[PDB]
Each structure stands twice: as structure tokens, then as C-alpha cells.
């Protein structure tokens, strides 16, 4: 479980999605807001 | 589960993340590549 901020997710989305594809789960933080979690379609369907 | 292409998601990540927090599970697609699914941290913890 890696964590990145919104500006890192936005400016580096292509690489972020490459990390996710491999198996990594990426949490996207935002000041005063609930974090979002990006997971692969395979991880999604397993659970 | 909603679905948006990479190009749209990159440009509109803020709206995507607000929709994810509002209760949607969003699939980001890229041609020839595995789709990524964005869930809220609450949905992720519930797994």
C-alpha cells in the first residue's frame, strides 16, 4: 500500500497506473478529503 | 461501476475522485492495457 497526493496522481497518472497493473495498491490523498484507492481490475474482481 | 478512458480521467481527476467519494467505483481504461479501478478508502477497508 503506497500513498501519493492528488498533484502526484494527476501529473504522473500513466506511471501510477503502471504500478497498479503490476500488483501495487495506490492510495490518493487530498487535503481534508477521504483518500481514494486505485487497484488493478484483477484485484478488484478477486475482492 | 462507471468507466472512463485515461485521457478523460487525467484531465478530470478531481471530478473522478469526488464521484468515487460520492459512492461510485470508477474504472479507468487504456487501450491494450488492463483497466484500473478506483474505490473509496471506506470501500477498500470493507474488503
Swiss-Prot record, chains A, B:
It comes from the Viruses. Keywords: Repressor, Toxin-antitoxin system, Transcription, Transcription regulation. Disulfide bonds: none annotated. GO terms for biological process: negative regulation of DNA-templated transcription. Coiled coil: none annotated. One of its GO terms (cellular component) is protein-DNA complex. GO terms for molecular function: DNA binding; DNA-binding transcription repressor activity; protein homodimerization activity; sequence-specific DNA binding; toxin sequestering activity. Degraded by the ClpXP protease. The keyword Repressor applies. Homodimer. Interacts with cognate toxin doc, the exact ratio of doc:phd varies from 1:1 to 1:3. Interaction with doc prevents both kinase activity and dephosphorylation of EF-Tu. Antitoxin component of a type II toxin-antitoxin (TA) system. A labile antitoxin that binds to cognate doc toxin and neutralizes its ability to phosphorylate host EF-Tu. Does not reverse phosphorylation. Bacteriophage P1 lysogenizes bacteria as a low-copy number plasmid; phd and doc proteins function in unison to stabilize plasmid number by inducing a lethal response to P1 plasmid prophage loss. The concentration of phd in P1 lysogens is far greater than that of the toxin it antagonizes. Such an excess may assure the well-being of carriers of the addicting plasmid. Belongs to the phD/YefM antitoxin family. This is Antitoxin phd. It comes from Escherichia phage P1. The chain holds residues 1 to 45 of 73 of the full protein.
Amino acid at each position: 500500500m503506497q500513498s501519493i497526493n492528488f498533484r502526484t496522481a494527476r501529473g504522473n497518472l500513466s506511471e501510477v497506473l503502471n504500478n497498479v497493473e503490476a500488483g501495487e495498491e495506490v492510495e490518493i490523498t487530498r487535503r481534508g478529503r477521504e483518500p481514494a484507492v486505485i487497484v488493478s481490475k484483477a484485484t478488484f474482481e478477486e475482492w
